[PDB]
Structure formats: structure tokens, C-alpha cells
């Protein structure tokens, strides 16, 4: 009985492969050959944020692209001011182990989660001027990998167990669950329109979910190892995925297959974080070889290198405005990079 | 303007207060000691926690030294992703049942993965080999477990340096030292990093495991400091 099901699944997979091969008409690298190279990208560190006293796993930028919140294993959640280097808030966490944080689009709430298997939400705007846990979200079985505010009232959380959930803060109960993954759901990135989001798991595959209905639409099995980072292209019709192969790969939703690979021979370490520039021409990608890299998103030529971190680069962010690029690391230092002419 | 000056002054005052709090908490953070109690299945973790929803904490302090013991309870079996979270701890208390399938081989394959992880290679490991009595009656009962689950037990002799048992069975002490030697050969095969292993034989349920942990942590800290001063 199971043999028939396995044969059917195999022949659907073969049909999908044949359809993708037939749809494969040209190559983005071939098309982009006749375009002017980006050139040398010189960016120097403008600010160093040196308040944390333990390694940083997460940072996030505000919508205004001025405030950034950073989390560390020492049970602190410090909210910086990038321009003046001052610290605005410092929230002592109940659990020392937090692997993620998220700054709400409204600027009112901040999320945080980790090995406690719960997501804590702090409302920064209080009458007494003190930050306190507004809500505790429990129901995930494994650790909490990533959490992104889809709104001020609903947050998507990707947990260690093979399950993503869409919550509702005003009531605290899950609204929709996203089952179908096989391994740890390491990362998660929302679409620009908050209509879709991709989740990169540890089974070397990525899915595309729609929050309103709640089922996967497409799958992208291009990689060959754990997927640690994921990021939508600014168009909202493509995304890049970092894995432990040291290769970023640009996928396309409409084409439903890869576009072009960002591998390099000199790179052996795994990819930890991935982000795009505002225009989508650049592709910053933090590595485990202590150095962040800048790629030409259309030609896969290394434009520049963001060397300067003592330990591995765990988190990488590009401002919504697009000016600066913050890179946290495991040496407990945040650095705000920028370019000058 | 004057308003922006007032805003900047308020921001500097808030920064000063937050920095004061951070400095005050830094001493506590640097004073406390973090341990990750990582047992390979049901090997005595319950009784070890007795004598001293995702993760657990047991704040026990000994000789004005504060200790954190983290027990990973509700996490999945997939350990390769959240174990990088614990490369800043001082030591990894590892618990092995020395008695479904062969548990000792699973313990060894977890131990060498922990040893050879590129982020955990700077972290020391402390071994507790529980179920000493269980191994004792298993050996005395003529049960074919070790002599056929490890073919190399036949050509093994108890080392001449260590024999502290008062009246225990020589076969039992040979089994104990064989298991300890297996873990020690795993530990000593690779000297890639700057970490050490402290194997212990947890037999009595008395308040001696806490003393062993305290002495091991003292040794770990002393080695780390002497290495940082390039003396060791």
C-alpha cells in the first residue's frame, strides 16, 4: 500500500521537475552579462554600539530606521538610538536564552523569544514609563526561532518544532497553524504586502504560505543543507536564502525555481544572515568566517567585504530607509556601516 | 534650538542611568557560573537535580559561588541548532548511564559531536557516570552486555595507577575504568581547542556531586586564567 503512495509521490516529483525544466528558458546570469558592474563598494563603520556584555543573536530596525533593538544571551533587550549612540531602553528578560527579537511597525511593541518556548511582548509606551510584559504567548513545543510582527495585533512565530503559528495578542490564542515542514523552522520573512511569507527550515527546503487561508502554495528545494537565513527581494516576487553550503540562492515565486547562485570557492563557512539593499541591486550576507560580504544581486560578483567583526556575524539588518547596514556579532558589538563618496 | 538641547540632555541622562544599571548587572553576570546539564536520556538527571516547559533552572550556591544549572526539558531530539546557544557556559555536565538500544554507544556519539563542534570546542565537559550499582549487579549477575557490546573489553586490563575500591569486584572496577577510558580516548583524540574533560564516577547519592562540580569549575576557571596569562 505504501509502495503505491511512494511511487505516486515520486512521479509527481518527476512531473514537477519536468515542468520546471520546460519553463527554464534562459539564465539571469546570461541576461545580466551586458550590464555595467556595480564596482567597488567601500563602506566604513560609522558607529559602534558597545553596551551588550554577551553575544548577540538578533537585532531589528524600526520603521523610522532610527531605533534598533538588540537581544543578547545575558538577558538584556537594549533599544539603541543609531544617530546619537545613546540607549533608550533596557528590558531585563525572564529567560536568559533568547534567539530572536522583533521591533513592531508601530514602534510600540517589542517581541522576544528563545529556548523558553514562549514569546514575550513588551509595550514600550506605558503611562508609568516602565516596560512590562504585555502578553505571554505559549503553545509552541520547541524553542522559538524567529518572530515577526505582521501587525500590532498578530505576530507570526516560527519554532523549533516543525510548525509555524499565527497568533492574536489581544486574546493570546493561535489563529492559524502552518504545518508541513520536516525540520526546525530556522528563519522567516514576511512579504512587503504582508500577504505571504516564506519559512526556511532545516530540511533544506523553503515554503510559501498565505496567512489569510493558511496552507503552503509552493516549495523551493534548491539548497542542499540547513537554511539559516531568508529575505524577500524588495519587489516581493523573489527571495534569497543562505544555507550551510556557503551559497546564497535567488529564487523566484512566479518562475517557481532558482535563478542564480552566489557560491564562491574561497568561502567554506555557513551563511548566518542575508539582507537586500533598498533597490535590490546589492545582497549583503553575513558569514561564519567573521566577514560579511556584498554581492551583485544580478551578476554574483563580490562587490565588497565588510570585515571588522571579531566573532561570527550572527545578525544583519538594512534600514527601511536604506542608508545604513547594522551588523551584530558574537563579540557583543553592533556596528553601523555606511558608504561615503 | 533649546528644545533639541533639552531632548539631548534627557537622552544623555537616560543613557547614564541605563549604563549604571548595566554596570551593576555586569558584576553579577561575571560572578555567577553557568552549567548546562546535558544528560543522554534517562541516566540519572532526575536524581541529580533532586540532590542539587522548555528549560529549567536550579539556583544552587556553594561557598559563596553562584551556579546556574540549565536542564533542556521540552526541546526536541534535534540538538544541532539550539546547542550553539550554550557555547558561553563554563562547563557542560554530561550524564551517562553506565548500565531501547545500546545507550553507551549513543552517549559516545553524542559526546564526540559535542567535543568536535566548532563552537563548543572552547567549552569543557564534566562527565558523571551514574548507575554504578546497576553496573555492579549487571556484572555480578553474568549478563552479556559489555563483553559483547564492546569487543575490545576482552583484551583490557585495569590500569595500575588507579585502584581505590575498598572491596568492590575487580570485574566491576575494570568495567568502570574501561568506560572511563573510552570517554577519555574520545576526549584526547582531538586537541583542537582549549577544553578539558573531567570524568567522575557518581555512585553514592550523598552530597558529594556538588563538591565535585565545584572543584571542576574551580579547575576550569584557573586553567582559563592561566592560559590567558600564557603561563599554562
Amino acid at each position, epitope marked *: 500500500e505504501l509502495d503505491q503512495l*511512494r511511487q505516486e509521490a515520486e512521479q509527481l516529483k518527476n512531473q514537477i521537475r519536468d515542468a520546471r525544466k520546460a519553463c527554464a528558458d534562459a539564465t539571469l546570469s546570461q541576461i545580466t552579462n551586458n550590464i555595467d558592474p556595480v564596482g567597488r563598494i567601500q563602506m566604513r563603520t560609522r558607529r559602534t554600539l558597545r553596551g551588550h556584555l554577551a553575544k548577540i543573536y538578533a537585532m531589528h530596525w524600526g520603521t523610522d530606521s532610527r531605533l534598533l533593538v538588540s537581544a543578547s544571551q545575558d538577558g538584556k533587550l537594549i533599544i539603541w538610538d543609531s544617530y546619537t549612540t545613546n540607549k533608550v531602553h533596557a528590558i531585563p528578560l525572564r529567560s536568559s536564552w533568547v534567539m530572536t527579537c522583533a521591533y513592531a511597525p508601530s514602534g510600540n511593541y517589542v517581541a522576544c523569544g528563545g529556548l523558553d518556548n514562549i514569546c514575550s511582548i513588551y509595550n514600550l509606551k506605558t503611562r508609568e514609563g516602565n516596560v512590562r510584559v504585555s502578553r505571554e504567548l505559549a503553545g509552541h513545543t520547541g524553542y522559538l526561532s524567529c518572530c515577526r510582527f505582521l501587525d500590532d495585533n498578530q505576530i507570526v512565530t516560527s519554532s523549533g518544532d*516543525t510548525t509555524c503559528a499565527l497568533w492574536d495578542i489581544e486574546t493570546g490564542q493561535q489563529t492559524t497553524t502552518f504545518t508541513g515542514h*520536516t*525540520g526546525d523552522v530556522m528563519s522567516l520573512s514576511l512579504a512587503p504586502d504582508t500577504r505571504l511569507f516564506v519559512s526556511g527550515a*532545516c*530540511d*533544506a*527546503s523553503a515554503k510559501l504560505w498565505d496567512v489569510r487561508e493558511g496552507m503552503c502554495r509552493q516549495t523551493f*528545494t*534548491g*539548497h*542542499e*543543507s*540547513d537554511i539559516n537565513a531568508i529575505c524577500f527581494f524588495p519587489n516581493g516576487n523573489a527571495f534569497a536564502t543562505g544555507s*550551510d*553550503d556557503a551559497t546564497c540562492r535567488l529564487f523566484d515565486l512566479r518562475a517557481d525555481q532558482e535563478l542564480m547562485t552566489y557560491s564562491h570557492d574561497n568561502i*567554506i563557512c*555557513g551563511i548566518t544572515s542575508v539582507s537586500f539593499s533598498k533597490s535590490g541591486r546589492l545582497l549583503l550576507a553575513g558569514y561564519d568566517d567573521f566577514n560579511c560580504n556584498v554581492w551583485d544581486a544580478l551578476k554574483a560578483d563580490r562587490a565588497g567585504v565588510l570585515a571588522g567583526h571579531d566573532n561570527r556575524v550572527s545578525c544583519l539588518g538594512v534600514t527601511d530607509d536604506g542608508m545604513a547596514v547594522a551588523t551584530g556579532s558574537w563579540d557583543s558589538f553592533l556596528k553601523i556601516w555606511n558608504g561615503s563618496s | 534650538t533649546e528644545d533639541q538641547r533639552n531632548e539631548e540632555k534627557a537622552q544623555r541622562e537616560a543613557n547614564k542611568k541605563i549604563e549604571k544599571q548595566l554596570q551593576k548587572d555586569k558584576q553579577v553576570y561575571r560572578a555567577t557560573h553557568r552549567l548546562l546539564l546535558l544528560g543522554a536520556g534517562e541516566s540519572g538527571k532526575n536524581t541529580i537535580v533532586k540532590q542539587m516547559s522548555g528549560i529549567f533552572e536550579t539556583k544552587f550556591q556553594v561557598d559563596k559561588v553562584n551556579f546556574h544549572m540549565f536542564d533542556v526539558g521540552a526541546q*526536541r*531530539d*534535534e*540538538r*544541532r541548532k539550539w*546547542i550553539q546557544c550554550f557555547n558561553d557556559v563554563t562547563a557542560i555536565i554530561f550524564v551517562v548511564a553506565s548500565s*531501547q*538500544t*545500546n545507550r553507551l*554507544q*549513543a552517549a559516545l*556519539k*553524542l559526546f*564526540d*559531536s*559535542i*567535543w*568536535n*563542534n*566548532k563552537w563548543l570546542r572552547d567549552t569543557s565537559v564534566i562527565l558523571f557516570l551514574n548507575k554504578q550499582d546497576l553496573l555492579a549487579e549487571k556484572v555480578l549477575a553474568g549478563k552479556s552486555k559489555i563483553e*559483547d*557490546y*564492546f*569487543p*575490545e573489553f576482552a583484551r583490557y586490563t585495569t590500569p595500575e595507577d588507579a585502584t581505590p575500591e575498598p572491596g568492590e569486584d575487580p570485574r566491576v572496577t575494570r568495567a568502570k575504568y574501561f568506560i572511563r577510558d573510552e570517554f577519555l580516548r574520545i576526549s584526547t583524540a582531538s586537541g583542537d581547542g582549549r577544553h578539558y574533560c573531567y570524568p567522575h564516577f557518581t555512585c553514592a547519592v550523598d552530597t558529594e556531586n556538588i563538591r565535585r562540580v565545584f572543584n571542576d569549575c574551580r579547575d576550569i576557571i584557573q586553567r582559563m586564567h592561566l592560559r590567558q596569562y600564557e603561563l599554562l
Partner: nanobody
Amino acid sequence: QVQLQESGGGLVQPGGSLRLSCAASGFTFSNYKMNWVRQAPGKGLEWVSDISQSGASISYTGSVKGRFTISRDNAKNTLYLQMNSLKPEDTAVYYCARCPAPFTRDCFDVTSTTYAYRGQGTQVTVS
């Protein structure tokens, strides 16, 4: 994507011979440490063997040393297990797992109920 599919297996008298092969068609074979895993009908998963990136460091689970031989061929992207002198205790389901990351001598989660980079079953019985 990885698509690890194994061959061989079946019925054999005790003390007989059998050969198991592993087919990998989704990654670079020469970068990953490939290891075999077997699961008894009633017991849990049990690590049985392994082999290094090049084929230098080889280890066995005990009670199978000598009678089991593991070798890899990077040219054809195939992993082998030459297994000899079987006993009824060898009856199990054999899986061809793969360590999650390349160029690492350590790989954590191979003997787990829900691994992602291991193949399907390969029935082996002895009677």
C-alpha cells in the same frame, strides 16, 4: 532534493553475505560525511557505521567490527556497506544517513526519529 535511495537487502540465512548500496543525487558527495543507521523492528534507531569525507576515518558500533565493511566512491556518488556473517539479531531496517553540514568532522542529529537527510528503508532479515 537530496534523494538518498538505497538498494540491496532481503532474506539470507545466518552467516551469509549481503551488500547494501546508497545512491545520492542531490549534493556534492565529497563534502559530506556519510554514515549508516539501522533500526530494529521493536527497538529504536542505532548508529552502525560511518566514513569520513575522503575515506580515512572509519568507525563501527561494536559487535559489527570486522564483519561489516563500509566504503565510498566519490566518482559515482555512491556509498557502500559490505556486511558479512549475519545473525538473526541483525534483522533490522537500514538507512543511509548524511551529516547535516559539510567540512565538519562532527554531525549531531543522525540517530533521530525525524531526520531530514536520511534515505528510505532497506529491509534486511535473517532466518
